[PDB]
Amino acid sequence: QTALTQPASVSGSPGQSITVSCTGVSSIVGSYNLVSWYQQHPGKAPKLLTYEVNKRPSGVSDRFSGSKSGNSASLTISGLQAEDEADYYCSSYDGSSTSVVFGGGTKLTVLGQPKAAPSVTLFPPSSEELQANKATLVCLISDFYPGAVTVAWKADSSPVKAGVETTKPSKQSNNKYAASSYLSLTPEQWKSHRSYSCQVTHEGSTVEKTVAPT
Amino acid sequence: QTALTQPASVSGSPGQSITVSCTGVSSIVGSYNLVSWYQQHPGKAPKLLTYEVNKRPSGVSDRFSGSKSGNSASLTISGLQAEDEADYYCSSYDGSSTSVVFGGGTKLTVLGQPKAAPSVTLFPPSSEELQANKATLVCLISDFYPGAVTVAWKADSSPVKAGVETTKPSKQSNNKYAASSYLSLTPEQWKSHRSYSCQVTHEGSTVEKTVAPT
C-alpha cells in the first residue's frame, strides 16, 4: 500500500533532541497543512501528539513540536526521556479525495539509560499452599536494566532441570523491567532438601538468594 | 470518556465469525462516513482493513466487512483464521482536530485450545526481606488462556491503589500464560492490616486469594 516515508528507527540519549521526518506529505489539491503525529506505546492505542502541523492538544508537553517544509513534515522531541521510547507515526489528509495516508512508523530507542542491578526476592511455599499438597517457589526479579536476565535454580548445590518456568521481562511503570521464575515441587521434594536457590545473572554479575523449609 | 469505545477483548474459534463494535462515531464532528478499521500484529504498523465504512483496499480478503448503523460501527470477520489474532482499532476522522481519532483497541484471540482459568498463588513477605525493612507481596497467576487478565489488590476490604506492578502476560512452555503482580509496602503498613487480597479477573470470572500476617 501507500504510506508517507519515515525512517524506520532513530535513537538518542536522555536530554538529547530527535527530529523524525515524514516525506510525501504535500497534498495534491488544497494546500493542506493537515499533518498530524501520533505516539504509540506497546499495547496501547495511538495517541495524538500534534495536529495541523504544529498545534498540540491539551496535556501534551511542549517538548514535542511539529513543523513543515514543502513536501516534508517533522516532529522534534526536545529533552529526550525514557518514556519517549515508543513508535511514532505521521499522517496527512492526502490528495486522495477525502482520504488519510499514514507513515510507515518510526521506532525511537532511548540509549544510554543507567544500568540497574536487579532486586531478587525469593519466596518459599506458603502454609496455605502446603495444605493443598503443593509447593511453589517464586523468585521475583525486579527493577533491572537492560531487560535481559538469566535465571537458574539449585536444590541444595545441584542444578534443578525440571519444573522451571521463567516469564519474559516486561517494562514496568518506572521504566525498569521485572520478571519472575517459579519452580513447582511436591511437598516431599521441598522438605527433602536443606535449601533451594535462585541464581540471577544480569550483565555478567550473578546474584543468588537461598531459602530453607521452616 | 473516549471519543470511540470498543470492547477490550473478544475471542472466537477457527471457522466462526465474530463482530467487533465501536461506539461514538456520530458525536465526532465532521466524521461523516470516514470510519476505518485497522488491524495490528505485534511489532508492525497498523494495516488498513476497511475505510469509508465498507470499502476494502487492494489485497484485503472479503472475509472482512464493515458496517455503520447510527452511533455504532462494526467490523465482522467471517471464517476466523489463526492469523487473524491481533489488535483491532476502529477510528474516525475528527473535524475538530483535522485528525484521525482511534478507539481503545480490541484484542482478538483465536481460540487454539480450550479456555483455561488461572491458578493464583499469593505469597506473603519473605522473612529475610522484612529483616531488611521491605515487604513485598507476590501474586502468581499461571496457566491461563487467553493471555489476558486484570488484577486488583485490597488492603483490608479497601482497594489498594499505589505500589502495584503487574507484568505483561507471558507464554510459558505448556503454551498457557503466566504473570505476576507484586505489591511493595513497608513492614509497618504490612502489619497495620489484617488481610490482603489478590483479585484476578479472567474472561468474566474472578478468583480471590488472601493472606494475613502470622
The answer to whether residues A91 and A100 touch, using CB atoms and an 8 Å cutoff, is yes
Can you name the residues that pair with B50 across neighbouring β-strands?
B37
DSSP at B187: H
Residues after which chain A is broken (C–N above 2.5 A) are: none
Q: Which residues in A183-205 are b (16+ Cβ under 10 Å) and which e?
A: bbbebeebeebeebbbbbebeee
Interface of A with B in 42-71 (CB under 8 A): 43-46, 48, 51-52, 55, 57
Distance from C-alpha of A160 to C-alpha of A190, rounded to nearest angstrom: 12
**CB of A121 less than 8 A from some CB of B:** yes
- Give this entry's resolution in angstroms: 2.3
- Cell numbers at residue B206, please? 474472578
Q: Is A37 helix (H, G, I), strand (E, B) or coil?
A: strand
Task: Note the helical H segments in B107-157.
Answer: 127-130
From A8, A18, A176, select the one nearest A84 (Cα to Cα): A18
What structural domains and CATH numbers belong to chain A?
2-112 (2.60.40.10), 113-213 (2.60.40.10)
Q: Tell me which chain B residue has its CA closest to the CA of residue A88.
A: B45
In whole angstroms, give the CA distance from residue A92 to residue A99: 9
Please say whether the beta carbons of A129 and A213 come within 8 A: no
Instruction: Answer for the pair A172, B167: CB distance below 8 angstroms, yes or no.
Output: yes
Instruction: Give the three-class secondary structure for A44.
Output: coil
| Alpha-helical segments (H) within B106-181 | 127-130
Q: Are strands A205-211 and A196-202 parallel, antiparallel or unpaired?
A: antiparallel
CB proximity B175 to A under 8 Å: no
Cα atoms in the Cβ-side hemisphere of radius 13 Å centred on A187? 10
Q: Extract the C-alpha cell encoding B51.
A: 475505510
Q: Residue B100: its chain A contacts at CB < 8 A?
A: 36, 91, 100
Say which residue the cell 493537515 belongs to. Answer: A34
In terms of DSSP H, where are the helices of chain A? 127-130, 187-191
Q: How far apart are CA B46 and CA B25, in angstroms?
A: 20
Distance CA(A92)–CA(B121), nearest Å, equals 50
- The torsion angles phi and psi of A23, rounded to 5 degrees, stand at -100, 155
Total Cβ atoms within 10 A of residue A102: 24
Instruction: Give the C-alpha separation, A185 to B5, whole Å.
Output: 45
Query: Which of B4, B31, B42 minimizes the C-alpha distance to B20?
Result: B4
Cα dist from B146 to A66, B4, B47, B116, whole Å = 40, 25, 23, 7
Site of grid cell 519473605: B126
Amino acid at B187: P
Kindly give the pairing relationship between strand A35-40 and strand B99-102. unpaired
> Both ends of chain B: CA-CA distance in Å?
44
C-alpha cell at A8: 524506520
Residue B205 corresponds to which amino acid? S
